[PDB]
């Protein structure tokens, strides 16, 4: 006579209790503008990110992209209030903790300066979640004066227990 | 009355249902040749990587290694059709999604050029899995002309929900 709460479910067809399949992997996409924020510079770039829900971890998969110039430090804001694919709600991206940072990852970049591409690395950390706005801080890295940045693919994940 | 599907199991000895212990940690090793692929250069090096299955994540643990020279970009192909330790099947390494990249990590290297070791980094992403061959793309990084690469230890993981 007991019931089962997600991710536990009762397969009435076979009278079997199991862990839900979507708990292991739930894919999606967010289409929108990635907001870069710095007191002296701010811009918006049209991006499409792949999302993966694996256990209580949400994975953000940034594809390769070319963006405007950035400061030696900066903030990345992804507004999940809109742009999520079908089946996803804005709440499904809320982290399960307020610890800062939740996770840090490194991104490979190329700074373009007067016709030369300079290899550098850029650190990214999950820092804040405010009302559907995810704030990914860019602490720093090797830097040089540049005109635009070429971003290699990179992924970052943080704990999320919403659904 | 109902039965339980993995990782849920019924301990008949104590009449208790629990999560399988191996679900939390399942270790193993893959022994074989690591294949580097680039149109102008390709080689094979004998390597042994440690594998551990934690929840729906498969972790690859690369030990320190010394390899031949590499291009500024490249792909690493690990053929899991053979070489896995006892208890592991080739299917146990298949990712749970096709998103590219599944995850990216950085590897520390030293490039050898005429007797000088130059510290550099390599971005690595899990990109493709085809009939047991795992494709780890090396998007780029700091580079210099070199004769051989010394690779620091590094780990990379991607979601896998197979058995």
């Amino acid at each position, epitope marked *: 006579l007991p019931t089962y709460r997600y991710p536990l479910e009762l397969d009435t067809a076979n009278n079997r209790v199991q862990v839900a399949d979507r708990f292991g992997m739930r894919t999606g996409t967010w289409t929108g503008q990635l907001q870069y924020q710095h007191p002296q510079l701010s811009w918006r770039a*049209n991006v499409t990110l792949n999302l993966m829900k694996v256990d209580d971890w949400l994975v953000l998969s940034f594809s*390769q992209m*070319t*963006t*405007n110039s950035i400061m030696a430090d900066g903030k990345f804001v992804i507004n999940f209030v809109s742009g999520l694919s079908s089946g996803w709600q804005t709440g499904d991206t809320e982290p399960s903790s307020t610890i800062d940072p939740l996770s840090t990852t490194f991104a*490979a*970049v*190329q700074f*373009l300066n*007067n*016709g*030369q*591409r300079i290899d550098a690395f850029r650190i990214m950390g999950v820092s804040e979640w405010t009302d559907g706005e995810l704030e990914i801080k860019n602490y720093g890295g090797t830097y040089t004066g540049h*005109t*635009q940045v*070429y*971003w*290699a693919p990179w992924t970052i994940m943080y704990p999320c227990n919403v659904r | 009355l109902p039965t339980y599907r993995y990782p849920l199991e019924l301990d008949t000895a104590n009449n208790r249902v629990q999560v399988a212990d191996r679900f939390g940690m399942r270790t193993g090793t893959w022994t074989g040749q690591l294949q580097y692929q680039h*149109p*102008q250069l390709s080689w094979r090096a004998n390597v042994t990587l440690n594998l551990m299955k934690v929840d729906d994540w498969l972790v690859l643990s690369f030990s320190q290694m010394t390899t031949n020279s590499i291009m*500024a*970009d490249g792909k690493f192909v690990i053929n899991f059709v053979s070489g896995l330790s006892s208890g592991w099947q080739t299917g146990d390494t298949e990712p749970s999604s096709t998103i590219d990249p599944l995850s990216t990590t950085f590897a520390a290297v030293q490039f050898l050029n005429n007797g000088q070791r130059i510290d550099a980094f390599r971005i690595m992403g899990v990109s493709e899995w085809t009939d047991g061959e795992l494709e780890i793309k090396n*998007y*780029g990084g700091t*580079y*210099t*002309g*070199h004769t051989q690469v010394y690779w620091a230890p590094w780990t990379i993981m991607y979601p896998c929900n197979v058995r």
Partner: antibody
Amino acid sequence: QVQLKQSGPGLVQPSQSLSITCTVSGFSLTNYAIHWVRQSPLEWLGVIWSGGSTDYNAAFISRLSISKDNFKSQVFFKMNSLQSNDTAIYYCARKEELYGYDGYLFFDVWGAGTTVTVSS
Amino acid sequence: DIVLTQSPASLAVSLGQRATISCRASKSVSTSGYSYMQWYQQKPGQPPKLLIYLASNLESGVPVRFSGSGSGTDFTLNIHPVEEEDAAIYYCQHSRELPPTFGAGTKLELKA
């Protein structure tokens, strides 16, 4: 069809403005850089990078100006001062903007060119 | 700046006989083991079509016969199978410096 066409006056008077407009149909200009070359009896003049940044030839600065519109998928070239020497077929060339080390100063696809003859 | 000079100005070769075009650069276009040069086939009345990117790499849709090899200071391309299609003029271009300069054109004439 991934093809790009540019429109502009064929003949320009001396000391007139030679302006050609390049239109892209297959690729989003936000991902590609559009270059400009002139073939006289091939010279690289300028490039507009994705994101609006422009770099011109050192010896041609202040006589050529390049702008682009991404929402309209157009690249605009305007030259202010003309001489007898600057008579050539002008072409707009394309390069993809990727993080890969492809040695980026190259041209993947070439538009038809506009024939420029300097005569009053 | 960075000047390139091709050799020769006119090349008279028969089909299936390799004609080698040498492009020599004022400064070494190769850096850190990579060579930043490009070769083009400009047909009469048509814009140039890229043949080789970087060093010895064939662009998509380019015949396998076209091949070039060379180091930073000077680059040469040799093409042993020469069919009727490839009768156009060839230019060499360098991608290292901020202003890329096309090399002097080389004219290939198929003999009949």
